[PDB]
RNA sequence: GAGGACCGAACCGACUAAUGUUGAAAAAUUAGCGGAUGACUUGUGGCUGGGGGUGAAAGGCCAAUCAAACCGGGAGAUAGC
RNA sequence: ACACAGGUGGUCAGGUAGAGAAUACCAAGGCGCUUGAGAGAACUCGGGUGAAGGAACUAGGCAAAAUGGUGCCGUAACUUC
RNA sequence: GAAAUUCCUUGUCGGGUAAGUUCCGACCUGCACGAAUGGCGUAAUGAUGGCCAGGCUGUCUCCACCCGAGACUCAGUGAAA
RNA sequence: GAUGUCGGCUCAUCACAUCCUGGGGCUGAAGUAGGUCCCAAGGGUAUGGCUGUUCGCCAUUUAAAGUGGUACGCGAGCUGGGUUUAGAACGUCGUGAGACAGUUCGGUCCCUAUCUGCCGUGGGCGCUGGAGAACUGAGGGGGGCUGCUCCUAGUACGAGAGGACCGGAGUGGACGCAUCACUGGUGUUCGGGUUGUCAUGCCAAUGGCACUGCCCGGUAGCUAAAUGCGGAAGAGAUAAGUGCUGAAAGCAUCUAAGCACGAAACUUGCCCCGAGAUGAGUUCUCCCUGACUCCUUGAGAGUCCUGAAGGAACGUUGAAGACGACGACGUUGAUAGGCCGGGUGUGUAAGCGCAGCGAUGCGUUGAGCUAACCGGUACUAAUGAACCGUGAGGCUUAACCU
């Protein structure tokens, strides 16, 4: 049973999952739209949107938290200097997912995820 | 004696003045609305059909809506029947409230038990595990033998095996009625009842008593 | 959750003092022996607190007549007549289970000055 | 464990009576580009619900 | 939560210092004895000139347990160790004259009133 | 500064367990295990040949073969089964 | 017999901790092991934690748990000293 | 000396355990020990056989939850007795 | 041209020659407690020490610790201690090789389930116009154990010792079902402490790796050791047994006619499944009220128009789930994520300042962070469509209106 539980295991261990979403969150902040599998995209929402919410309030402590969670100074700077202000008046829902068929190699269901104001 | 349809809100406790904590299941019993009365002449048996709660119109189909409209009542979230005793009479469109239980000491509560999915024999039937060690080969939670030999050369019906567990109708009998609060549409019974929070419950005066 | 909230709120006590893990508290509880009702005190260190509304509890440890004893009180129970803080303790942890392995000088808790 | 008797072609077919595929019930038509597409998916030219959502 | 092979301290001055449960009395397949339950014991250690000898088989009443006791409001009382009071095998009256450490009100009955009266504290 | 000395990697082994048993492997993997300056271990090359070799001896080993190797021949041995 | 968890003699020997060629994390350098995507049933495999009890398990404490370093104090019977 | 030997036999007595066909100490009625196909001892040694205890524990009472790899679903390839 | 062994473990199923519990006759049955026989198979029916043991003896329980059948039930379910390969030794026998249901130490347990069977779960068609619901209940399954204390009553009985039937109340053991409010376990998705090392330029702050590095706590969920509930009462027909009235047989006789009692067995009462119950049942409600052509002329075929109720599909999903299935929701919207507030958990973040040579302490500060929780909120994603399903539903005979 998994009654009421949240989060996807994605056939990985916890350290792999944490690292992969750190990288993928960085890619989405950098490029503003990426293509990935539909389940990974759904999971990435729960990682990326709290980072933007955090970047709404610029302070040394929040920059350090964002650096702890992304380990990329270019990504932290983009968060606090661009994305925070771009989304200062939006109450959540900073990304949108668009389904786009199936991968050639493995028939995996695919989706684009983008920032809403891209 | 008819019963009423309610909803499992959750569990809590009632502290009494002499220092006893009574665990209770909180059951929300909104007014039950009589939608059909069945009798010997037309249906061959005596019962009432009730609805309760509310439903959204675009999820109410035309056949359901016609049934409710004949009754003259608003659509609820489902329909349930209760058989009538010899001296019980009701009329279509009547409302029955939780005050029906005001003087009832004990109740039977029926619900759909929580769903465990496919369960093994240890959990489903309380089978004993075999050795964790002492040489056991791949057989720690497995069922063991399932029969005899050439006689009878088959497995008997009703053999206890792995399969779906829970998610089925269950009645718990003879629960104390701790509180009837008609103003808040509340029934408080002592102890646990089947089903997840939010689920539908059928509550009747206890058959054993 | 409002129905159960109302049911719980009407039962909560209104005069529970503030206390922290590491404090010494005296709890006065009702004891019935036949027809008589009297208060018995239980005083010791608070080693755990469960903050859970009407279901709040706290655990008190003492060494009694040569024997360690723990009582888990249900905070809003009418059996508990009163709680009073005798001494304020200075600890870091929320749960002081390590005190179970300590006696005498090793089990002392510094006073919290404030 | 293994069969004692060779199963028949008839029984093979009976087992496969559940194997057929099902075609997509119907495709959707983008209100701007007019392309057919799987419902709730973008079009091959990158439209969704009449908006050019992605380039190429 | 005492079972066969559980070792218990002795809350009296009978002379026994360590006893082992060898049977939970009072029912077929009965698993556990708690506070206020009678068990069969063997004496595994005793002081030299006491009232009982190492190797004796007799009865005892459990008076303190680590698992503890629950009260009608949900509260719990737990002790640091398991302890019992030795009883004569036939009369089920205590063998010692003194009781050491606190006991609980679960012993408040006609059977264990001597223990209740002798205990330094009753919780 | 002795030692078929001691603890312990490489190196040489193979005491226990799980796995594996149409294997990842026709003898292994994993966790533990023994020796580890010696009657030690290892590279290259040499010598011993089948009723024969070699054997700190288990009928062990002598090319995934051993109470008499392998290949060819007598040979279509013989077979009251 | 395989793009096979096996076997294969010699040489080189950085940093921090460390007695160390053990072990952990790294350097130079080299790699992610030639099916992937989901799900989060029973059961199997490899692991983590467990209330009270503590060998009651079992042929048998099998397996597991446990002990584990350096310095100092201290150490019985027996002995071929 | 009831033994790596004792059939009768779980011999009998003592010890250890609540309870001991095993174990230890004895007795001698040695079915069927016995002096280099050596007798009786023996410090040290042993992945050697038996027995007891402290510690320790999911071995067990009696199982529960969790983390991974399969199992299950989709796409590609595609065996076996 | 192979039907694997003793014992253990796991899982059982039947018989009754009944171990307990239920009912009864006789007793050399005062009572309590027994003996013996009859009826009775509903349910129940030890844990340990020794030994490979089955058995047995022993310890300590229990209402009791039943006897047998099922390939001496069960190794394509587990074990492998014993028996029964190859090594080795003792006693013994033999000149010897060797031997011994004598002993002793050591000694590889394979199989991915086609069919039957069984546990679960779907797809098809049927049930005669289609569709959405609520049911009836033929039939099937589950369940059915019992201790102790108190009252009756120190009464009946008994010289005393002792000590009841019948009836009533309470509280347990074992078993079962549900649940998570409490007490707890888990809680690699939350918070903190800390060792070694590498990195982010460095300080400070952080991250990776080392079993989650090692640990201390812990939310939701799952859960037992946690805590609610259950076994019944009642009814019908009976077993053994006990009778009433009563002749055959002037008496007697429970029986031949007639009538009455009588048990955990039987049929019900309680719980679950259940109309594929093809004997395919009932009730409520909803929907469809066009045109033409052809042939072998009929429950015929075809074309145009029409496309309902409803369903399905797709999407967002769920204490529902292996997949199917089942439930919720799709902008006329709280279905999921995010967001806002709260709770919970951890336990006083960072930065700055003060004290101290410094490690560190103190203030700002119960701070900061906080999963699966609670209350809200259209920010994001749940699309306008399209698809399936039709167009008043056979014959015969009655009854009735017509
Ligand atoms: K179960
Ligand atoms: K050499
Ligand atoms: K030879
Ligand atoms: K060869
Ligand atoms: K030869
Ligand atoms: K390393
Ligand atoms: K799955
Ligand atoms: K699954
Ligand atoms: K002898
Ligand atoms: K002999
Ligand atoms: K003995
Ligand atoms: K000789
Ligand atoms: K000699
Ligand atoms: K050895
Ligand atoms: K030895
Ligand atoms: K049987
Ligand atoms: K009987
Ligand atoms: K009798
Ligand atoms: K029976
Ligand atoms: K025997
Ligand atoms: K057989
Ligand atoms: K086997
Ligand atoms: K077979
Ligand atoms: K098997
Ligand atoms: K061996
Ligand atoms: K067959
Ligand atoms: K089927
Ligand atoms: K009773
Ligand atoms: K709980
Ligand atoms: K919990
Ligand atoms: K670090
Ligand atoms: K920095
Ligand atoms: K008569
Ligand atoms: K039907
Ligand atoms: K299902
Ligand atoms: K939401
Ligand atoms: K808090
Ligand atoms: K501070
Ligand atoms: K600070
Ligand atoms: K806080
Ligand atoms: Mg959720
Ligand atoms: Mg995979
Ligand atoms: Mg790691
Ligand atoms: Mg479920
Ligand atoms: Mg078991
Ligand atoms: Mg094996
Ligand atoms: Mg295993
Ligand atoms: Mg047959
Ligand atoms: Mg055949
Ligand atoms: Mg198929
Ligand atoms: Mg040496
Ligand atoms: Mg060798
Ligand atoms: Mg190895
Ligand atoms: Mg050595
Ligand atoms: Mg060594
Ligand atoms: Mg030759
Ligand atoms: Mg030989
Ligand atoms: Mg060879
Ligand atoms: Mg020859
Ligand atoms: Mg010839
Ligand atoms: Mg020939
Ligand atoms: Mg490869
Ligand atoms: Mg290779
Ligand atoms: Mg090498
Ligand atoms: Mg180095
Ligand atoms: Mg290394
Ligand atoms: Mg490099
Ligand atoms: Mg798993
Ligand atoms: Mg496991
Ligand atoms: Mg562990
Ligand atoms: Mg434990
Ligand atoms: Mg803990
Ligand atoms: Mg513990
Ligand atoms: Mg212990
Ligand atoms: Mg044992
Ligand atoms: Mg045993
Ligand atoms: Mg071991
Ligand atoms: Mg270990
Ligand atoms: Mg013998
Ligand atoms: Mg003997
Ligand atoms: Mg003896
Ligand atoms: Mg001897
Ligand atoms: Mg000899
Ligand atoms: Mg001789
Ligand atoms: Mg001589
Ligand atoms: Mg001689
Ligand atoms: Mg000689
Ligand atoms: Mg010799
Ligand atoms: Mg000797
Ligand atoms: Mg050696
Ligand atoms: Mg496939
Ligand atoms: Mg054959
Ligand atoms: Mg009979
Ligand atoms: Mg009787
Ligand atoms: Mg039966
Ligand atoms: Mg029967
Ligand atoms: Mg019955
Ligand atoms: Mg023992
Ligand atoms: Mg034994
Ligand atoms: Mg057999
Ligand atoms: Mg049998
Ligand atoms: Mg078999
Ligand atoms: Mg064997
Ligand atoms: Mg033989
Ligand atoms: Mg052995
Ligand atoms: Mg043997
Ligand atoms: Mg097998
Ligand atoms: Mg069907
Ligand atoms: Mg049938
Ligand atoms: Mg039945
Ligand atoms: Mg229970
Ligand atoms: Mg809760
Ligand atoms: Mg906890
Ligand atoms: Mg933890
Ligand atoms: Mg997180
Ligand atoms: Mg952490
Ligand atoms: Mg630093
Ligand atoms: Mg690294
Ligand atoms: Mg590394
Ligand atoms: Mg009758
Ligand atoms: Mg007469
Ligand atoms: Mg009964
Ligand atoms: Mg819409
Ligand atoms: Mg601080
Ligand atoms: Mg910190
Ligand atoms: Mg402060
Ligand atoms: Mg918050």
mmCIF file of C-alpha atoms in Angstrom, chain C residues 44-106:
data_model
loop_
_atom_site.group_PDB
_atom_site.id
_atom_site.type_symbol
_atom_site.label_atom_id
_atom_site.label_comp_id
_atom_site.label_asym_id
_atom_site.label_seq_id
_atom_site.Cartn_x
_atom_site.Cartn_y
_atom_site.Cartn_z
ATOM 1 C CA UNK C 44 9.877 14.947 38.219
ATOM 2 C CA UNK C 45 11.614 16.057 35.011
ATOM 3 C CA UNK C 46 9.631 16.582 31.812
ATOM 4 C CA UNK C 47 11.403 14.406 29.258
ATOM 5 C CA UNK C 48 8.888 14.554 26.409
ATOM 6 C CA UNK C 49 5.988 16.723 25.237
ATOM 7 C CA UNK C 50 3.404 15.794 22.589
ATOM 8 C CA UNK C 51 1.619 18.938 21.329
ATOM 9 C CA UNK C 52 -1.538 17.611 19.719
ATOM 10 C CA UNK C 53 -4.477 19.824 20.751
ATOM 11 C CA UNK C 54 -6.939 17.891 22.900
ATOM 12 C CA UNK C 55 -4.603 14.892 22.526
ATOM 13 C CA UNK C 56 -1.601 16.657 24.021
ATOM 14 C CA UNK C 57 0.444 14.623 26.483
ATOM 15 C CA UNK C 58 3.630 14.955 28.452
ATOM 16 C CA UNK C 59 6.018 12.489 30.094
ATOM 17 C CA UNK C 60 7.477 12.971 33.585
ATOM 18 C CA UNK C 61 10.386 10.927 35.012
ATOM 19 C CA UNK C 62 11.319 10.516 38.655
ATOM 20 C CA UNK C 63 13.365 8.243 40.871
ATOM 21 C CA UNK C 64 10.934 6.960 43.489
ATOM 22 C CA UNK C 65 11.886 4.817 46.492
ATOM 23 C CA UNK C 66 14.907 3.454 44.658
ATOM 24 C CA UNK C 67 13.106 2.913 41.330
ATOM 25 C CA UNK C 68 12.850 5.000 38.162
ATOM 26 C CA UNK C 69 9.256 5.670 37.078
ATOM 27 C CA UNK C 70 7.747 7.453 34.097
ATOM 28 C CA UNK C 71 4.177 8.691 33.830
ATOM 29 C CA UNK C 72 2.661 9.785 30.517
ATOM 30 C CA UNK C 73 -0.056 12.284 31.420
ATOM 31 C CA UNK C 74 -2.879 13.187 29.047
ATOM 32 C CA UNK C 75 -2.835 16.956 29.404
ATOM 33 C CA UNK C 76 -6.557 17.703 29.135
ATOM 34 C CA UNK C 77 -7.695 14.741 31.198
ATOM 35 C CA UNK C 78 -9.811 15.744 34.213
ATOM 36 C CA UNK C 79 -7.743 13.214 36.211
ATOM 37 C CA UNK C 80 -4.931 15.787 36.120
ATOM 38 C CA UNK C 81 -6.070 18.471 38.545
ATOM 39 C CA UNK C 82 -3.098 20.791 38.205
ATOM 40 C CA UNK C 83 0.420 21.298 36.841
ATOM 41 C CA UNK C 84 3.061 23.597 38.295
ATOM 42 C CA UNK C 85 6.663 24.270 37.279
ATOM 43 C CA UNK C 86 9.031 23.882 40.243
ATOM 44 C CA UNK C 87 12.292 24.548 38.376
ATOM 45 C CA UNK C 88 13.274 25.646 34.861
ATOM 46 C CA UNK C 89 15.726 23.356 33.073
ATOM 47 C CA UNK C 90 18.270 24.171 30.367
ATOM 48 C CA UNK C 91 18.529 21.490 27.662
ATOM 49 C CA UNK C 92 18.950 21.494 23.905
ATOM 50 C CA UNK C 93 16.816 18.533 22.846
ATOM 51 C CA UNK C 94 13.034 18.241 22.591
ATOM 52 C CA UNK C 95 13.138 14.658 23.957
ATOM 53 C CA UNK C 96 15.410 13.773 26.867
ATOM 54 C CA UNK C 97 15.428 9.997 26.535
ATOM 55 C CA UNK C 98 19.188 9.898 27.249
ATOM 56 C CA UNK C 99 18.334 10.559 30.896
ATOM 57 C CA UNK C 100 17.098 6.957 31.075
ATOM 58 C CA UNK C 101 20.744 5.834 30.989
ATOM 59 C CA UNK C 102 21.847 8.269 33.728
ATOM 60 C CA UNK C 103 21.571 8.488 37.512
ATOM 61 C CA UNK C 104 22.779 10.749 40.294
ATOM 62 C CA UNK C 105 25.392 13.299 39.285
ATOM 63 C CA UNK C 106 25.290 12.261 35.622
#
